[PDB]
Design a protein around this ligand. Structure first.
Ligand SMILES: *[C@@H]1O[C@H](CO)[C@@H](O[C@@H]2O[C@H](CO)[C@@H](O[C@@H]3O[C@H](CO[C@H]4O[C@H](CO)[C@@H](O)[C@H](O)[C@@H]4O)[C@@H](O)[C@H](O[C@H]4O[C@H](CO)[C@@H](O)[C@H](O)[C@@H]4O)[C@@H]3O)[C@H](O)[C@H]2NC(C)=O)[C@H](O)[C@H]1NC(C)=O
Ligand SMILES: CC(C)[C@H](C(=O)N1CCC2(CC1)Oc1ccccc1O2)c1ccc(Cl)cc1
Ligand SMILES: CCCCCCCCO[C@@H]1O[C@H](CO)[C@@H](O)[C@H](O)[C@H]1O
Ligand SMILES: CCCCCCCCO[C@@H]1O[C@H](CO)[C@@H](O)[C@H](O)[C@H]1O
Ligand SMILES: CCCCCCCCO[C@@H]1O[C@H](CO)[C@@H](O)[C@H](O)[C@H]1O
Ligand SMILES: CCCCCCCCO[C@@H]1O[C@H](CO)[C@@H](O)[C@H](O)[C@H]1O
Ligand SMILES: *C(=O)CCCCCCCCCCCCCCC
Length: 326
């Protein structure tokens, strides 16, 4: 008797006192004090105020600078759009619901907010996977007669949308489901109940294998091989101080990107490990949503790492912000 069940929700709070209410109807101030809902709102406001400008500016400077519109940069624009889906499908709705203390848009809005927020995060995840694959192909040259062009980059972008849809769409039609989660102000995949009517168990396995294990392996393999190839070529040209300088910065950047990916990935692994190692206590709204809570900031630091640290985008952003000068 850990929470309270109802049609389309699971409030992680016991109803022996009789105070639990539908998260679609009344504020959940027994899960958390009102000031903590306000802090959830303040957190959403921070993500909005940092997330929108950085990601919109990425799309904007690409319009003004011809040299950014190269096929290898298409996946980065896809990343920027995905973060905007998270900013407007998730953060802004959650800022609005948190100030009410519950999900005021009903079960239909729960599927909408759940779908688009899950879609945004999925497109971003697979954009990082596709970018790793593309860089591996260009550098390690595993295909002998291959040249990466416009059609290939479009293929990679469409691939992320397909992978994002095959995660975000099944809960709309009977495999798992979308319900309020955590403090019940935002909606997502039901990892919290074993709803047999929608076969939640098998969807969690499928999420774990395809959308969690595989992205980590691909990112690690591609960047591992890329670093190996680059170190290998630089070893054959140690008389070039710039070759060694480029090798050091490629390695340093791959380390930064892998560590950033692990900072978002490991919390899920730790919490899932705890849920399956102990598996004997009730998990409050906060605990099993802690990985999701901190993974939201990826809408801010991913464009910082993949775009603002790119030498091209940075100078074009400075030129755009400073009205064409400097
Ligand atoms: C967590 O647990 C709490 C406590 O159990 C639940 O809250 C209760 O929910 C029930 C509804 O399931 C509330 O029901 C009350 O009784 C009447 C319902 O209509 C009945 O009317 C008669 C009497 O039985 C019959 O025709 C028929 O059986 C109907 O089922 C209403 O009359 C009540 O309305 C209010 O006004 C009347 C006067 O009209 C007052 O006298 C009543 O006291 C009442 O306040 C009401 O609908 C019950 O009141 C709820 N209790 C509390 C404390 O809120 C939650 O549902 C549960 N949470 C979740 C998420 O499931
Ligand atoms: C993009 C999200 C839609 C998706 C996501 O939210 N989940 C999938 C992974 C998850 C938690 C739910 O599923 C799991 C199933 C079982 C065990 C652990 C699990 O972790 C995601 C989030 C962060 C990363 Cl890095 C990768 C994927
Ligand atoms: C951009 C920010 C918009 C915030 C809108 C917040 C509207 C809050 O609305 C309030 O919600 C309470 C439930 O907690 C109700 O009791 C109040 O009657 C209602 O006015
Ligand atoms: C390196 C990974 C970058 C993308 C991270 C995306 C994080 C998405 O996080 C997910 O968001 C959903 C909607 O809010 C929630 O329902 C899920 O519980 C949460 O894990
Ligand atoms: C998933 C891809 C991660 C690649 C991380 C590669 C980090 C390698 O980093 C390099 O390691 C060498 C020893 O192996 C050291 O001699 C170098 O100084 C160091 O730059
Ligand atoms: C670091 C301080 C605790 C952070 C974890 C707080 C967990 C509250 O749970 C939160 O509920 C919100 C409303 O549904 C969701 O939008 C968040 O994804 C979820 O983490
Ligand atoms: C190039 O940058 C020349 C233009 C001068 C811009 C300087 C002003 C930028 C200030 C950005 C920080 C805004 C802070 C708002 C905090 C709420």
């Amino acid at each position: 008797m850990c929470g309270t069940e109802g049609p389309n929700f699971y409030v992680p709070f016991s109803n022996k006192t009789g105070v639990v209410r539908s998260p679609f109807e009344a504020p959940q101030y027994y899960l958390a004090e009102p000031w903590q809902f306000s802090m959830l709102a303040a957190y959403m406001f921070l993500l909005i105020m940092l997330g929108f400008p950085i990601n919109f500016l990425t799309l904007y400077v690409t319009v003004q600078h011809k040299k950014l519109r190269t096929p290898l940069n298409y996946i980065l624009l896809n990343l920027a759009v995905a973060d905007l889906f998270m900013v407007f499908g998730g953060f802004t709705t959650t800022l609005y619901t948190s100030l009410h203390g519950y999900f005021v848009f009903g079960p239909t809005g729960c599927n909408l907010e759940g779908f688009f927020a899950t879609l945004g995060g999925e497109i971003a995840l697979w954009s990082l996977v596709v970018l790793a694959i593309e860089r591996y192909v260009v550098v390690c040259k595993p295909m002998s007669n291959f040249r990466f062009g416009e059609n290939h980059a479009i293929m990679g972008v469409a691939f992320t949308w397909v992978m994002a849809l095959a995660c975000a769409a099944p809960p709309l039609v009977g495999w798992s489901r979308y319900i309020p989660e955590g403090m019940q102000c935002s909606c997502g995949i039901d990892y919290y109940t074993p709803h047999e009517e929608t076969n939640n168990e098998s969807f969690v396995i499928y999420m774990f294998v395809v959308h969690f294990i595989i992205p980590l392996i691909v990112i690690f393999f591609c960047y591992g091989q890329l670093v190996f190839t680059v170190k290998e070529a630089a070893a054959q040209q140690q008389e070039s101080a710039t070759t060694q300088k480029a090798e050091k910065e490629v390695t340093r950047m791959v380390i930064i990107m892998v560590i950033a990916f692990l900072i978002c990935w490991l919390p899920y692994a730790g919490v899932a490990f705890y849920i399956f190692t102990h598996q004997g206590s009730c998990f409050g709204p906060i605990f099993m949503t802690i990985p999701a809570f901190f993974a939201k900031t990826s809408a801010v630091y991913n464009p910082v790492i993949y775009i603002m640290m790119n030498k091209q985008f940075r100078n074009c952003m400075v030129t755009t912000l400073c009205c064409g000068k400097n």
